[PDB]
Design a protein around this ligand. Structure first.
Ligand code: MGP
Ligand code: MGP
Lengths: 328, 325
């Protein structure tokens, strides 16, 4: 399967080989064809796009060196990440390099005044679900990496400050005697948080389990999810979280889909699970309510019902719910 | 599927509900039935076990409060993690992991005499029992997080251990990590994709090796999942990046935790759409197509090459392709 769920599609080729090519990156930074994306507090600069009278779609305000040349003069006040090179199979190494630039919110509102037509897409939820399919992944990659730099400014091993390197996909500790510099450790590389999201099916196969936290919007039920524990497997993390939150024992756990979640860095691992019990014992400390919903109740929601609703189609939870109805 | 690959099996129930129950943990710390595992520089204390004339099996030297009571008096010099409760007053066999100074460890090793520390992690950790493996995988992974994430990456200040050793809080009041729920506070899990690339004709498979790899050993191609990247697309990426082979369909096959220090192997069986190999040399020293006969020879008793042990996921995906043929 070729991952399709929102954030799975990109307009770029990561080209990680060009990351340790300082001579190349430096040349592409000043190149005119090079595309730049502006970010303020992990929020991308987007304009509104060629439409005639109809509802206009949100597109990323694609900057060039001409605009961004001024901001680059303060490398201590900015964060530049090389995203990759554009895809163009149809029709100097002619590659459209793409970069991501993080700036101060003091200098950002200054830029927003000059832009006038371009604006920052905030809050990340649900605003980030508006972008184009291929633009989504580019933002998912950008936001995730920038979020790592914004919150991992220091070395967790010794506490000393860190230097950005390898085009923004590495961080080196400046304390010479630090043990992080002796070998290869995760402290230097960017974080990816694995999350399991599961569609639990009743032992009779006619119902499915859905729940909600306190923060969740009123009357909205979704698939149960949780972070994979260290030294734990994908399948056993599914069996754990369902029993922990709802008190429902799980049997077979089948992997179904992939969905990146740039909040800030997370990877949703969608699973279709078969439950072996029927009683629900809600934790209240992890989930406010959990219930068994019949296939008719769900079919009503996925079409146009109802006393409850599920997440949008651009959220993996919705796709696993859709999967069970088709698989029935 | 119920994950079977080495490190997938545990003797415990994690019981994360009991983590924020400080009153309960304190009572179980002094309880006699409670099991303790000693660790020195992420290496567990193991004894040897019974069998006569043949290879003796490696087992964990299961300590009790009677032994460990002295070490607990210095909480600044130790790291205690609540693992979980054994699967079989709330009659539950609590299990803990204790990290100690190598100065105080060699002092204990002298008293133990029969128990010894299982070092180096590779390949020594592959010797343990199936169910003991996962317990070590869980323990080593968490202890390794505490040993290298002693400070807050957001502001640089020191951090406090909490929630039975599954959380770390920054002590700087104005720190933004204390403002909301962030990954800086929780333990790390590094996702890795390991893929079995099948030749477009299905009779061959792609295997490669780095410079560090033991001489003449070829394995499945693997790599870390990039931020904002999917499991399937990370497979299609790494294969083309290392070997220059274009990948088609990517099918998930198996789960395998890798406590080196924290990693989760996501085994996939992928179909190649190209045949030419263009080795990177900066990531892989050599890559080749191996026929099913060449592979069958290795998995039995050949050969000019060999694959990883059966307790490594790479070996299981290789076995999977032979069965699936
Ligand atoms: C990076 N990060 C962010 N959070 C936030 O803290 C909240 C606590 O709630 P939660 O951790 O139970 O969320 P869940 O595990 O279902 O994952 P998600 O729905 O895919 O996000 C989460 O819902 C996130 O908004 C996180 N929460 C936890 N527990 N662990 C993390 O690593 C983490
Ligand atoms: C936690 N960590 C440890 N390493 C070590 O650095 C080496 C660099 O080599 P590698 O990163 O290419 O290993 P691979 O991606 O094939 O993953 P593995 O075979 O499952 O480990 C790895 O082989 C590890 O020994 C790591 N290497 C990288 N790149 N990133 C990490 O997060 C990381």
């Amino acid at each position: 399967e070729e991952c399709e769920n929102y954030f799975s599609k990109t307009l770029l080729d990561r080209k990680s080989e060009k990351r340790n090519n300082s001579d190349w990156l430096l040349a592409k930074e000043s190149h005119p064809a090079t595309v730049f994306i502006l970010f303020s507090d992990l929020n991308p600069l987007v304009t509104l796009g060629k439409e005639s009278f109809q509802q206009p779609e949100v597109r990323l305000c694609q900057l060039n060196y001409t605009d961004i040349k001024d901001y680059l003069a303060q490398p201590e006040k900015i964060t530049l990440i090389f995203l990759g090179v554009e895809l163009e199979i149809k029709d100097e190494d002619g590659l459209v390099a793409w970069f991501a630039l993080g700036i101060d919110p003091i200098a950002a509102e200054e830029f927003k005044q000059r832009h006038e037509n371009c604006y920052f897409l905030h809050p990340p939820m649900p605003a980030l679900l508006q972008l184009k399919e291929k633009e989504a992944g580019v933002v998912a990659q950008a936001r995730s990496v920038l979020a790592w730099h914004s919150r991992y400014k220091f070395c967790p091993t010794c506490g000393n400050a860190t230097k950005i390197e390898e085009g923004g996909y590495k961080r080196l500790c400046l304390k010479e005697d630090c043990p992080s510099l002796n070998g290869v450790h995760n402290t230097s590389y960017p974080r990816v948080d694995p999350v399991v999201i599961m569609q639990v099916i009743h032992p009779d196969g006619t119902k499915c389990l859905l729940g909600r936290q306190k923060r969740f919007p009123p009357g909205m039920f979704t698939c149960l999810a949780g972070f994979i524990e260290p030294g734990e497997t994908i399948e056993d993390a599914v069996r754990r979280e369902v029993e922990e939150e709802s008190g429902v024992k799980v049997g077979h756990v089948q992997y179904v889909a992939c969905q990146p979640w740039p909040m800030p860095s997370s990877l949703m691992i969608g699973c279709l699970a078969l439950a072996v019990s029927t009683e629900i014992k809600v934790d209240k400390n992890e989930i406010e309510d959990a219930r068994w919903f019949t296939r008719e109740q769900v079919l009503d929601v996925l079409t146009k019902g109802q006393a409850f609703f599920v997440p949008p189609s651009r959220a993996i939870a919705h796709q696993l719910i859709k999967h069970w109805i088709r698989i029935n």
